[PDB]
């Protein structure tokens, strides 16, 4: 029988740590010879396990790589000009590695080149509450000044947006030990901590969604029209370069000014934590010099796309897809998800070769060019937009499968909930303690849901990963998985290694999954996800759960805009359309669910499964979010404080944000009344996709 | 037997003369009582007829009507302020109607309130040429002068917008025999032209569309938030009012200054049509005085919705539409098509009271406002817009059927045109000396297509009508019949006797269709292709037919291009990729039609019809037009120097027209080839909607 237990049970942990290991003998820098190999390379693997057409679809995008003969450094300079001090040029490389080449040393993509000279502002994790605390509590201005910042917490686009803003004239990032180090680990390579040489890469764009910079709207192909890069979208105005807490323990040791205003402001370094502006009294004459000289350069970027043609519905899509490219050797990010991917093809494909085909058509994605602001998947989505939004299912994610050996993470559309309930309920915990019970069982127990008794946590989809043109630009239906930390015991941001040179196989093997049990229970969601989306003869979408959450981030922005009573009155601000609309959206979702359960008729069923589809593409506004035309989703949109993070009622939530300090607020709270108008409208109209057709 | 010979069959000449009688009795001008109780019939009498359901849908939207206590007019005034001639405060009623209370006196809808004072400037049909001749050629100054213009040509909007950036602080319209009046003809009510004291009505916005004012991107239903009327879209910010040629004779006769250009620009009158500015030697210090009262206020409009519920696919809707109100009695303008829609409602339930349905659901609309800018239709299209863009396989409109007696016009979609060449072949013709032959040979005699041998004309649709949201902004196929005069042997403009107080239930039945045979002709024609796209297994579209047409506007705009040949070569100006994108699409079209003639299976079957019924909305670009977001189609927009009539290639016509003017040739022609670039992608992607789905 080909069911999906025979697809599950064809999954091997022992394949997925082959093929990990083959992912990360070299980097994969996007852009590089290396990585259009191995684009060949999978493609060429995905013919032979049985997909009915694989393709590269290339782009020519910006991106962004240092100059290999004028390498960037900051330094303190004396009195003199003389540079008493220089950051590193590279990470020490880890054991065995010590001679490979094209490692790209530290840099921040996209930065603009420079050398600017001046003092240091240390402006803690450089969120928005960091500015408004040095600008409004501490009154200390960093116009002029070079600003140091911690990374974690948020996007560092999102940090160098706020350094520009507060008239900045550069940006260090460092990572701190706070931050990067968990307490009784060692380091690479003796225990998963970041040791003081190394230091996170990372581009800091700020896109809204947009893809390659020269080209919003339309794919980067061979006759595209590109746009200056004075009108590029989303490059930082500012020289940016990160280091490690070696280098930053020197920066910080000296500075002066203002003490740090409260305990969370000091990190783990010996070092006081001053704000500054400036180096304390013997070293007032010292300052603080960038020199950056990367260049921006179009180059072009490959993505593999492999089709498994639908039986019945070869016209309905469901998209599994992840990124190929990394930083150095990407042995978490993102190949632990690219080896998830390339054997749950290498699964379906064994299905195929034995005479099965899925109901609807699978569609297989390695992208490129992620890491540089998830420039491959935007471009072919663009390019594809309007295949993609009459006849896209859905789309899941598969990057990094592990950043923890603790419990699941889910982030997903609430059309999905249901699915993975069920879908967890089946597979088995691979934790110990749990043997022979459910991975829902063990996720339930490690990760209760805040809201419901023996449920788990899922969370909202933000951005910073290749869903977001499918989920907030076109309106598919989104979801993502992977093993994760325990959040609660833990002070430490994502996983210490992140984007260094020593996130290895090795890392790997070692520390996080030595027996690649939690790796085949993520290839097991992913697979298994993907599996009932295309061979269910309904879809697996219970659209009674977003009337649930409605209600829920309604009360969640009400509550909000009730800190301002006065305001209220004055203004006649009035959520009771909003309320009224999530009302109406809960009792026809009820009704619908009824007619999906008592409805031989493929017509009925299909246009119940359109129905189906389309309801996620009903919360598109087709003018988009303010100034941020390329984010759609009126319910979820990347936080504008934080892309990593996603936020709820986003357009009612950025004209509530700070709004005590606006200095017109008849015209800021008109505007909180047209985005709930906005938000009640769309809540309704999405609801009547789902009333009776005629 | 029920098939579309028994629809066509059912419709009778002498119940659309019944309804046009009843409809044309009153005015029915938006807004106002008697179109509320004329709404309110209408779906008392669908619901009679036998529709599955019939419900008004109602918005609040902002209307223009004059001041009854304080009305408008135009004067001359002397040196000492006295007003020593004044323009007509209404039309002389027709015969028998004297009495008739309730009609609106002339006036230019969304006027703003002024008494400015100046010296006339005459600017022909104050079109974009006309304003090139007068500032470029003629030197003469319009900033601070009224200016005069005559109807005719253009969209009256267009006028006041190209007045408005000449400077002027007013326009007077005026109707000139030469436009409005047919030689040989006797004056209403002994015959069909403008009497010298008739006045046409009609808005003068600019919405690009929009729909109401207040309310762009969302409908006005009763939370909605409105813009204050200083943000409103589309509004004039001088003093407009229109005028007959007695009183235009008045205002023109003492005209001095420069002599008209040519003869392109004197009408018929007895006047010089000197340009001016200002009046000649003895007259110099009298100048004209406007007197303009009218008040914009937001009021509530009715749309009337009947469902005829399909069989088979009653998620997939085919609209037939077309306006109720009227500036005054609408005798052609709209209940000659309000009359033909109630006959084909009627004649469809007449079908379904003997138990047949469609195979598609049908829905009947009575629009409301259209005259004060396509309002209802607007409205309503943004609360649908979801079920619309997901479900609508086409809109048929129905505004009026007649505007002369002499051959059939259709303007469509290229989706459309097989469709209505194999319809008219089954048609009789009524024409005199075609007794015996189709409706096909009579219009390819009387009408030949410029192109083709045996073909007769189909015009691209512009804008204008209830079609624009359907066609330019959701992209759903969409078209329209009429019967209309001889365009060579005839000088004038429409009909004369346009939104004026002569254009009634008279004026039809003694001068245009006395036998009502022309209105029953354009009910087959329009009936007839509503049975076909809401009964046919297939969808009868034809894709090669989109091909051909892509072509031709390809070499059009190209050969436009090409008069700058210096240019192209400076800046490396190619149409090779929109070419490229045709050819594509040519072939895949091609090979598309062989596999649709080529294909039991409802599901291959439904996935062509999804093809078919999403090829006209691939050519929608969701970022819109520059500066038109609600222009979306990348073929066909409505002209930016006349609403009424289509232009194809926009967005590349729109980027070459006057470039030679332009300050800045780099930058000029730098955004010619970003919309090639725009078209050909569309082009491209258009087509790939039409390749194999996997
Ligand atoms: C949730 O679903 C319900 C339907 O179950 C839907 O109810 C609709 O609410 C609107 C109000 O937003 C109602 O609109 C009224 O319609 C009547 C005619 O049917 C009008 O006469 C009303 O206008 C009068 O009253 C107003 C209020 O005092 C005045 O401002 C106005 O000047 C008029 O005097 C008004 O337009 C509508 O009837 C119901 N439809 C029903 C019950 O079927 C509700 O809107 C949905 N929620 C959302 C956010 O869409
Ligand atoms: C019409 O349909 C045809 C397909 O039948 C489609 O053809 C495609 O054209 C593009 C060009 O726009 C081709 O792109 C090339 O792809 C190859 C790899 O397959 C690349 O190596 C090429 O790049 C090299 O050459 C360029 C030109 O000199 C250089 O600028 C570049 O730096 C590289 O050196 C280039 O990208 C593509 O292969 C074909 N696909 C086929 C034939 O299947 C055509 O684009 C369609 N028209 C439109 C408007 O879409
Ligand atoms: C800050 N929050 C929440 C957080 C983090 N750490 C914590 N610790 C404790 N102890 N406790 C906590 N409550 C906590 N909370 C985040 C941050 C990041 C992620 C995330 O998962 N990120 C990656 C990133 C994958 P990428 O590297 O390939 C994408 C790339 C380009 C992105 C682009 O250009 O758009 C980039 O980010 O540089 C992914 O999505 O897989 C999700 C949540
Ligand atoms: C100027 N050209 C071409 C033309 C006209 N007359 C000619 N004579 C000779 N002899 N020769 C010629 N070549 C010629 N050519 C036009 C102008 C108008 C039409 C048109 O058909 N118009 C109505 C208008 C219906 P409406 O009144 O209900 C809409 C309303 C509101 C519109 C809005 O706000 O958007 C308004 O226009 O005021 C319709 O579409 O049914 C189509 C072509
Ligand atoms: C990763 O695996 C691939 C696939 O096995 C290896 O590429 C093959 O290498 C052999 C020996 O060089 C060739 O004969 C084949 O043609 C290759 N197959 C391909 C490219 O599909 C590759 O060597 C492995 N890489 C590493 C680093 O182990
Ligand atoms: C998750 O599983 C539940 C429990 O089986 C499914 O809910 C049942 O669905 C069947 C089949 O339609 C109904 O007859 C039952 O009454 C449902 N039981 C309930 C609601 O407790 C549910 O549909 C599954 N969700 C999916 C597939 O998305
Ligand atoms: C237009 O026709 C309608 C429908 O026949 C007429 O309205 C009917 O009038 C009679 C007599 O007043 C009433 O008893 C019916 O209730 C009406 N039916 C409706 C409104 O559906 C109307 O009188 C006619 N109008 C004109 C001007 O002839
Ligand atoms: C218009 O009528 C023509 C002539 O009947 C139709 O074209 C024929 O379609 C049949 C049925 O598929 C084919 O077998 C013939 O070969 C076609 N003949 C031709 C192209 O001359 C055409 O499809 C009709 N158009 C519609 C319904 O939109
Ligand atoms: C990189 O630096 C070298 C050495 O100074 C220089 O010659 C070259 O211009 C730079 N390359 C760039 C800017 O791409
Ligand atoms: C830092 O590097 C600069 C540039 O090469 C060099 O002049 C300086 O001597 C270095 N300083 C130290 C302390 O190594
Ligand atoms: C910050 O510093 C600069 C002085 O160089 C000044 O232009 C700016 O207005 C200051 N902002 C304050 C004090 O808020
Ligand atoms: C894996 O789990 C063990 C046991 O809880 C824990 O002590 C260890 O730190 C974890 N490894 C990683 C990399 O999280
Ligand atoms: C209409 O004119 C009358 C008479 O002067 C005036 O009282 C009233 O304000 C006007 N109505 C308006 C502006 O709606
Ligand atoms: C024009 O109307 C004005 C306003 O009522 C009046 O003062 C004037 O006498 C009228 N002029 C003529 C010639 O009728
Ligand atoms: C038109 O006239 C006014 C003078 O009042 C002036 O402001 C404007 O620049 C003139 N334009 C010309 C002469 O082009
Ligand atoms: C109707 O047709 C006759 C015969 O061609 C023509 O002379 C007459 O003017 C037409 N009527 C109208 C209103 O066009
Ligand atoms: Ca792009
Ligand atoms: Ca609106
Ligand atoms: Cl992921
Ligand atoms: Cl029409
Ligand atoms: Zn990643
Ligand atoms: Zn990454
Ligand atoms: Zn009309
Ligand atoms: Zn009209």
């Not at 001090?85 to 530290?106: A, C, K, Q, R, W």
């Not at 323990?249 to 740090?260: C, D, I, N, R, W």
């Not at 969370?459 to 977001?468: H, I, P, T, V």
Request: charged share 20%; net charge neutral.
């Amino acid at each position: 029988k080909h069911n999906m237990k025979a697809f599950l049970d064809e999954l091997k942990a022992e394949n997925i740590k082959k093929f990990l290991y083959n992912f990360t003998q070299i980097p994969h820098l996007a852009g590089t010879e290396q990585n259009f190999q191995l684009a060949k390379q999978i493609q060429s693997q995905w013919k032979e396990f049985g997909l009915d057409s694989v393709e590269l679809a290339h782009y020519d995008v910006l991106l962004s790589y240092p100059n290999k003969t004028h390498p960037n450094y900051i330094s303190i300079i004396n009195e003199d000009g003389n540079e008493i001090f220089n950051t590193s040029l590279f990470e020490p490389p880890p054991p065995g590695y010590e001679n490979v080449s094209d490692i790209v040393p530290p840099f921040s993509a996209f930065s603009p080149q420079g050398m600017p000279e001046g003092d240091l502002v240390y402006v803690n994790y450089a969120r928005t509450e960091d500015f408004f605390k040095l600008e409004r509590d501490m009154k200390i201005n960093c116009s002029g000044k070079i600003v140091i910042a911690r990374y974690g917490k948020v996007f560092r686009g999102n940090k160098v947006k706020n350094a520009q803003l507060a008239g900045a004239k550069g940006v260090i990032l460092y990572s701190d030990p706070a931050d990067y180090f968990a307490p009784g680990v060692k380091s690479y390579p003796d225990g998963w901590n970041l040791p003081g040489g190394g230091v996170q890469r990372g581009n800091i764009l700020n896109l809204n969604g947009a893809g390659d910079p020269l080209t919003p709207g339309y794919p980067a192909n061979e006759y595209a029209y590109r746009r200056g890069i004075a009108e590029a979208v989303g490059l930082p105005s500012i020289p940016v370069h990160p280091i490690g807490y070696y280098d930053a323990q020197k920066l910080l040791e000296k500075m002066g000014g203002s003490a740090p205003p409260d305990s969370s402001w000091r990190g783990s370094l010996k070092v006081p934590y001053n704000v500054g502006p400036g180096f304390t009294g013997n070293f007032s004459t010292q300052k603080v010099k960038m020199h950056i000289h990367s260049t921006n350069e179009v180059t072009r970027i490959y993505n593999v796309i492999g089709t498994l043609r639908g039986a019945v519905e070869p016209d309905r899509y469901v998209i599994l897809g992840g990124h190929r490219d990394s930083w150095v050797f990407g042995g978490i990010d993102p190949q632990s998800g690219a080896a998830v991917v390339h054997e749950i093809v290498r699964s379906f494909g064994t299905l195929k070769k034995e005479g099965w085909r899925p109901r609807r058509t699978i569609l297989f994605a390695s992208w490129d060019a992620e890491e540089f602001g998830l420039l491959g998947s935007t471009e072919w989505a663009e390019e594809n937009s309007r295949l993609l939004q009459e006849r896209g299912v859905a789309y899941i994610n598969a990057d990094s499968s592990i950043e923890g050996n603790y419990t699941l993470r889910v982030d997903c559309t609430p059309l999905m909930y249901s699915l993975v309930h069920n879908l967890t309920k089946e597979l088995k915990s691979p934790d110990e303690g749990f043997e022979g019970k459910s991975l829902y069982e063990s996720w339930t127990k490690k990760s209760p849901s805040p809201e419901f008794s023996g449920m788990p946590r899922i969370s909202k989809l933000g951005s910073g990963n290749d869903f977001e043109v499918f989920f907030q630009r076109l309106g598919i239906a989104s979801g993502r998985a992977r093993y994760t930390k325990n959040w609660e015991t833990n002070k430490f941001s994502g996983y210490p290694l992140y984007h260094s040179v020593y996130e290895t196989y090795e890392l790997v093997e070692k520390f996080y999954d030595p027996m690649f049990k939690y790796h085949l229970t993520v290839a097991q969601v992913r697979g298994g996800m993907v599996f009932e989306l295309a061979n269910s003869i309904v879809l697996p979408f219970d659209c009674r759960d977003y009337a649930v959450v409605l209600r829920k981030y309604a009360d969640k922005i009400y509550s909000i805009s009730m800190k301002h009573p006065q305001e209220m009155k004055t203004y006649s601000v009035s959520f009771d359309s909003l309320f009224s609309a999530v009302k109406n959206f809960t009792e026809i979702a009820s009704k619908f669910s009824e007619r999906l359960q008592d409805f031989s008729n493929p017509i009925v069923l299909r246009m119940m499964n359109d129905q189906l589809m389309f309801l996620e593409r009903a919360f598109i506004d087709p003018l988009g979010l303010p100034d941020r035309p390329f984010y759609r989703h009126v319910i979820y949109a990347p936080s504008s404080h934080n892309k990593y993070a996603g936020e709820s009622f986003p357009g009612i939530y950025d004209a509530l944000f700070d709004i005590e300090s606006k200095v017109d607020p008849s015209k800021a709270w008109g505007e909180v009344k047209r985005q709930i108008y906005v938000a009640a409208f769309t809540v309704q109209a999405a609801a009547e996709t789902l009333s009776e057709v005629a």
